[PDB]
Write a protein that binds this ligand. Structure first.
Ligand SMILES: FC(F)(F)c1cc(Br)c2nc[nH]c2c1
Lengths: 308, 296, 307
């Protein structure tokens, strides 16, 4: 049987992503009804950098599937350094049934997935955050119903992991995705081209614009994220001035549909990419969105384990 | 309607009695209560590591059917853009309770006003209320009724054990004496809260520099590490112990620096209940969790 | 009496055979034994971290129905804050067994002298007895009966793997050879203990600087890294003396044609072992690594029922 991995959002076809999201809704209703890891079987959860959301959602989600998460800070273990990556993956494949890895370069994930004989999941990387976007899609479906044909606009740094994954995962769900970002901060060209091609299959579309007002108008869903990740703090750029016109504020939200909702991958810098009034107001779905990391990641793991 | 346990007086006298009864029932049947079956999650967060706090809470939560997500001090420095209100809101979607070892009471109070699940003070600078629940469980199983008993704490009277022994002690009806040198006395608002609670239970509060009179007729003698000249007269030694009531029991929340605040002869002797006391952290904290969860 | 496992000879030949049989049974049926159901707790304490030791113990304890409380080295180190005796007395109230990776053997002996639960040496400076249980399980599943096999270890002859292959090997009736350069020889007390145990089992102990002689006709070839972190600053050139003892294709070709190769991992490819040997048909290093899980579960089951 071919071993399935989930490193980027387009690793699932449109029909596959729909199966995962339906399973996420089922598991939210009945959270201990699927026990593929009963035993317990192990799952490795490896961090090159920590995250409250990633830690809590995976460790508890794996336990609720009957399994046992072994949670490792790769800084402490010096992964890749004390032995080859291939040697590590061969031994992991003997102790666990899946590998969940938060790491930086996408090439590292690809390397691990090409040698491991268990599913590899990208918990969060520099280029993609596909588990967050599964949770986002679950949240949108909860509140709006059918995903096909919705209009979603993302604002801020157009080349970070959330911009890339909202493009790929959004068009895989049939959502028309707009990225509003200033010049110099636009999506990676190969990611954009992949999203445009996948959008053809689903009847969705990809738009990239510097006009925040135009991106917000008529939108069903508005999304933003922090303007700067940790690796970019020393990149030499002013990472405030280019982004101020793209702030998700009350004025911008008033341009979207009356029933629009707001999403934000945590953490948030209130006053930069998003204001208190929007973050804490009635259109915000950020806390359900964070909860749904637990359910959507469980669904992904059930689905990958069962097909591998 | 969400109950928290940040200081000993957060429990009324009747409520503390319920928790201690539950601790005794759970010591006898440790897997008979499964409110976290699933597993449901509990966060166990350390701003500063505490190995013995981690053992008792992590195993206790598991024996309730749950799964402890244990976060050590290394991640205390939250990353860029992380807050406390937002952390509390997210934790409340993943876990059914939050156990937190932090420093200032201000931080505990802040988490508790935002979180929609119970918050437990695992250990703080001002109070150690889970240790005192275990201490009261230890006294009761060895001596029976706590009301009327006479307890004396020796040493640093300004630290978290002195404060919690005052508040939790008088909540149980114990006559509490702190014996401490001049610069190391209870915080005055804590002392006043304890004097107030004591009127409801028939207990009392005494603060003295006279170790001999604190030990004289004591039923329970407690000490704790000092951190050093001002504490030497309060050393819990063979000599003070002779002054107490017969069958008096000695407590010490660990670790002990043998030959500083307490002697080998007292700690290894037949008055010592220090090992049962340490075990009872497990039972008393499980009881507290069961009790908080069913009211929240 | 409470049984501890601090060194390989803590098990008699008969008891070691019982543990290894249990490891084969647990490999077949990994969740059929639940002595820690509840869960009961097991302490897994690291004075220095070992990730593969963490994985195997943490999952193994869970599959016995228990809950491992894992303490990494980022906590205040045992012994500094209170006596080891005091710490052992508290641990004994919280858990049913203590698994500990520490440094000198006297710390293990101290903890076991007072603990009322079994103490297991996860890994120490002098011995690695759980790794050698996994090694023996691997050899037995690749070779059948252990008695009379010839095993040669190459490299630093005084590290924990050399000492444990000597002790655990002769306990199983294996003729053990340590091939090491002058000045890196087994501890004499350990060599004498292995020589005495070998009289009971028909085994033998050989120590030699002749790598070629040690490889010739061997059934099992073993090596390990030449240097631990603790040794990086010891002032020795820790490469030149060891290159004649590299486990490479030429050395392997001297052994029996059905010989297998073990390495407790991690490996430094190109130093103590070559890519060709470690990725070739004689290598059993991946089954070896997996068997840490099964052999340590067997040990825990066995110690818990005898204590
Ligand atoms: F699979 C093993 F063996 F347990 C493992 C896992 C990790 Br994550 C590691 N990081 C450095 N060495 C490692 C070894």
């Amino acid at each position: 049987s071919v071993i399935r991995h989930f490193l980027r959002d387009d690793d699932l076809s449109p029909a596959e992503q729909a199966e995962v999201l339906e399973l996420a809704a089922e598991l939210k209703k009945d959270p201990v009804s699927r026990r593929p890891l009963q035993g317990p079987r192990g799952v490795a959860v490896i961090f090159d950098k920590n995250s409250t959301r990633t830690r809590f959602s995976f460790e508890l989600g794996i336990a609720q599937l009957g399994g046992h998460a072994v949670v490792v800070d790769s800084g402490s273990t010096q992964l890749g350094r004390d032995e080859t990556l291939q040697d590590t993956a061969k031994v992991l494949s003997r102790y666990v049934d899946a590998i969940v890895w938060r790491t930086f370069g996408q090439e590292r994930l690809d390397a691990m997935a090409s040698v491991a004989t268990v599913p590899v999941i990208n918990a969060l990387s520099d280029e993609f955050h596909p588990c967050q976007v599964l949770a986002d899609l679950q949240t949108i479906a909860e509140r709006k119903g059918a995903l096909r044909g919705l209009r979603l606009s993302y604002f801020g740094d157009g080349a970070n992991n959330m911009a890339h994954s909202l493009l790929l995962g959004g068009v895989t769900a049939g959502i028309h995705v707009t990225v509003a970002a200033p010049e110099g901060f636009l999506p990676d060209p190969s990611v954009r081209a992949a999203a445009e091609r996948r959008a053809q299959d689903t009847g969705a579309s990809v738009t990239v614009t510097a006009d925040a007002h135009a991106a917000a108008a008529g939108a069903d869903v508005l999304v933003t994220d922090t303007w700067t990740s940790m690796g970019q703090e020393n990149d030499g750029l002013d990472r405030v001035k280019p982004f101020r016109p793209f702030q998700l504020n009350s004025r911008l939200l008033a341009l979207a549909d009356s029933d629009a909702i707001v999403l934000h991958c945590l953490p948030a810098h209130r006053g930069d990419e998003i204001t208190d009034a929007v973050m804490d107001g009635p259109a915000s779905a950020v806390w359900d969105e964070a909860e749904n990391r637990l359910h959507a990641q469980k669904a992904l793991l059930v689905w990958l384990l069962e097909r591998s």
